[PDB]
Amino acid sequence: AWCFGFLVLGYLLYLVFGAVVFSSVELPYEDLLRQELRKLKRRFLEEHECLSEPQLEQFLGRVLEASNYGVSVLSNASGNWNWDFTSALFFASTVLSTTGYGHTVPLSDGGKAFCIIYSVIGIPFTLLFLTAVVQRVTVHVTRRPVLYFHIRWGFSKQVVAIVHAVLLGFVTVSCFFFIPAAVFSVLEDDWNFLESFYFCFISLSTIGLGDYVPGEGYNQKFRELYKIGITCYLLLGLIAMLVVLETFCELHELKKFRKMFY
Amino acid sequence: AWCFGFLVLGYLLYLVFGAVVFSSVELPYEDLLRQELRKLKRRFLEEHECLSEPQLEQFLGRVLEASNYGVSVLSNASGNWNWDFTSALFFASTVLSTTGYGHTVPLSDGGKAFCIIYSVIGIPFTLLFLTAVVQRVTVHVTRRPVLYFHIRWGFSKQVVAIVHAVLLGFVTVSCFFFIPAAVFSVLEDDWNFLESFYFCFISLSTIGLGDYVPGEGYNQKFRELYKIGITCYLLLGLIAMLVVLETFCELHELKKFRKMFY
Ligand SMILES: CCCCCCCCCCCCCC
Ligand SMILES: CCCCCCCCCCCCCC
Ligand SMILES: CCCCCCCC
Ligand SMILES: CCCCCCCC
Ligand SMILES: [K+]
Ligand SMILES: [K+]
Ligand SMILES: [K+]
């Protein structure tokens, strides 16, 4: 009934809350870096006294645009190749999965045209693949065992459904957040558990903001195999998430909530 | 029946197709830029003959990391502020909407911890808001008029549903892709219709790869109002997309397909 307006107001106010706290958290840091660059650049020109400021600007602009794409001039402009076939496979999985990883400017002019045609057919297609798998998977993982819980012990399905949903909710977080976060943290030599879990969450959830992809390690050994394994893991984790989500919707308490709310 | 395996093989082969074409499209361009930096940096050191290469590396690394975050040293390190309250509001809407816009490294250490707690409660919440609105909206926009089409002219609902779905599919693309792409293209002075439509598609779809957000224009006048209007537009466009998607699922031909497929 009228409560629907309450949800909209609460949600929009929640968004405002998120915005203000994000600004407070990131404003002193960004200001600190801004001040740091505003002294470092000036210092560079000061001590050298041999280089000109307008002339430096063209070089800085070109390199910065290059790093916006994702190619760095560091290491004699010879870092780990960024657009090899394997990384492209990770990129395609992340576009279809809607995680959308990539750099500040991800694709060149021609590649933005192609993405549109590729994705516009491949999003309903991947969605069709995902729904079919969760459908087939959910019957085997969740509905059929609930019947086993219902037949052998002969007690209320609703009690089983809540308990089954929570236990599944725990295993998937255990198996697909805590364990992978540990794996990535030990593997990558520049991360810790919090940051690795951040990547896990932002990957299994389809946010995928920015890039922040494990694999940018210089002189990585099995970079290709790593890339293809984190792609299969990503897609499959989205399935597991899209199964625990499905079971929660089936629950009487949650499905009743949405209907009573409306 | 067995056809399910055919879908999985076709989908995975489709992903491989996307990867190879993406690599071919982006490999010569990235190589060209890589070669260009591999001559430009060397030229810079050559003509100046006053600056040292290892000493330059620290400065380049610091600035490049700063631009990975999204703060540029250009314009005397005083460009349009990036983390003001309004931009943060756009960022929060894009995290909840799962579009995930942001730079190569979007958030500092503290802000990655906060995002997890904020999003983990706010994704089921925004999802709950979205489903409620499409539910209420769909009845008014689609079901009730279909009844008008069904009562007044008294002919097959299925014919109406297909025709109604296509017409709705046309209006929303007309109203929320072609028109906004035109608006952004004329507004922003550095884009054209193709690129603007690319942003529209990647925004209404939850991909949102990289950043590529209109608003980075230097000396923008009404940047704040622009930011808040493109946030309301983004969220609302996701609603319209999540309504045309819903109506297509209702169609007998499409719902039959998924069931016959399974
Ligand atoms: C790829 C299909 C569309 C997007 C699906 C997004 C699912 C998000 C699930 C979030 C689960 C809860 C995380 C805390
Ligand atoms: C909002 C959170 C769940 C994800 C919904 C994604 C919807 C994608 C719609 C794509 C429509 C393409 C039309 C041509
Ligand atoms: C029960 C079918 C699972 C299929 C998983 C495919 C992962 C690429
Ligand atoms: C029919 C209700 C529409 C609500 C729109 C809210 C936009 C922020
Ligand atoms: K995304
Ligand atoms: K998404
Ligand atoms: K994204």
Swiss-Prot record, chains A, B:
Residues annotated as site: Part of a hydrophobic barrier that is stochastically dewetted and limits ion permeability: 127, 242
TM ranges: 2-22, 114-137, 163-183, 225-248
Family: Belongs to the two pore domain potassium channel (TC 1.A.1.8) family.
Residues in the Cytoplasmic compartment per record: 138-162
Single GO MF descriptor: potassium ion leak channel activity
Official protein name in the record: Potassium channel subfamily K member 1
Catalytic activity: K(+)(in) = K(+)(out); NH4(+)(in) = NH4(+)(out); Na(+)(in) = Na(+)(out); Rb(+)(in) = Rb(+)(out)
Compartment(s) where it occurs, according to its Swiss-Prot or TrEMBL record: Cell membrane; Recycling endosome; Apical cell membrane; Cytoplasmic vesicle
Extracellular side: 23-84, 104-113, 184-192, 213-224
Protein modification: Sumoylation is controversial. Sumoylated by UBE2I. Not sumoylated when expressed in xenopus oocytes or mammalian cells. Sumoylation inactivates the channel, but does not interfere with expression at the cell membrane. Sumoylation of a single subunit is sufficient to silence the dimeric channel. Sumoylation of KCNK1 is sufficient to silence heterodimeric channels formed by KCNK1 and KCNK3 or KCNK9. Desumoylated by SENP1; this activates the channel. Desumoylated by SENP1; this strongly increases halothane-mediated activation of heterodimeric channels formed with KCNK9.
